[PDB]
């Protein structure tokens, strides 16, 4: 179906969850998979293992497109992200670019207070 043959893997690692979205070069999503949607709810959805099985599961569900090349775009910090791109070249993809696209303000908005734990 529609046979795009090149895409972008936007991986959005945060501290609590990694969410991998495989799209095309136009930016239209072709299929996604989160670490929290792969079993292991909770303290286990923020691990490199959960991110890699999230990326394995996002490599599935884009078989209908015949993607061979993809760029990787990485957001946020997280226990994910590093393992995530590994799972992508464990799934036959030719990984072309690895950009880190974490949003950094140039002293913009005030961050929240928190955490007197």
């Amino acid at each position: 179906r529609k046979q795009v043959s090149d895409g972008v893997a936007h991986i959005h690692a945060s501290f609590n969850n990694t969410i991998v979205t495989i799209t095309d070069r136009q930016g239209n999503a072709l299929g996604w998979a989160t670490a929290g949607g792969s079993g292991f709810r909770g303290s286990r959805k923020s691990t490199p293992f959960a991110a890699q099985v999230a990326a394995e599961r996002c490599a599935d569900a884009v078989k209908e497109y015949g993607i061979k090349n993809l760029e990787v775009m990485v957001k946020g910090p997280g226990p994910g992200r590093e393992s995530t791109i590994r799972a992508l070249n464990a799934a036959g993809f030719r990984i072309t670019n690895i950009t880190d696209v974490t949003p950094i303000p140039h002293n913009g908005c005030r961050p929240p207070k928190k955490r007197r734990v």
């Binding site: 292991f40 303290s43 286990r44 691990t47 293992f49």
Partner: protein, 151 residues
């Protein structure tokens, strides 16, 4: 074990088959320091195991014990103020030690007549891996398979 790294003591092999593996199996089975009784039970039970399966003695034992050896097991950490059940790879001596402990314990659980029949039927139920010790191995492997996310 706080300081002292240790050696280990050498067990005498089995007086019928020369197997230190099976010698440790009669030590796992032994209760109250009665070794003669336990080796009688092991010789009777493995003798009917060799007669039933028709293979031989200690390769029927080695198959029936090969189906119950754990691969990896969970283990508590308590490092970050939390209780984790991490999976960890079992050492070979601990591997077959756990194998024998589960066979013997499951054989004590059974409801047959004599201990040689309970353990002969437990090793026979472990030869086609359908007994209780294989459910203990699958249980351990479900715990270490569910919690795979910690390594």
């Amino acid at each position: 074990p706080r300081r002292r790294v240790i050696g280990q003591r050498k067990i005498l092999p089995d007086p019928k088959f020369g197997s230190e593996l099976l010698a440790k199996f009669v030590n796992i089975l032994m209760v109250d320091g009665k070794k003669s009784t336990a080796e009688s039970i092991v010789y009777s039970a493995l003798e009917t195991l060799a007669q039933r399966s028709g293979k031989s003695e200690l390769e029927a034992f080695e198959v029936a014990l090969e189906n119950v050896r754990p691969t990896v097991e969970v283990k508590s950490r308590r490092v970050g103020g939390s209780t984790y059940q991490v999976p960890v790879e079992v050492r070979p001596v601990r591997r077959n030690a756990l194998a024998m402990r589960w066979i013997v314990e499951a054989a004590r659980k059974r409801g047959d007549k004599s201990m040689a029949l309970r353990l002969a039927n437990e090793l026979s139920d472990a030869a086609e891996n359908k007994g209780t010790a294989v459910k203990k191995r699958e249980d351990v492997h479900r715990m270490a398979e569910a919690n795979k996310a910690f390594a």
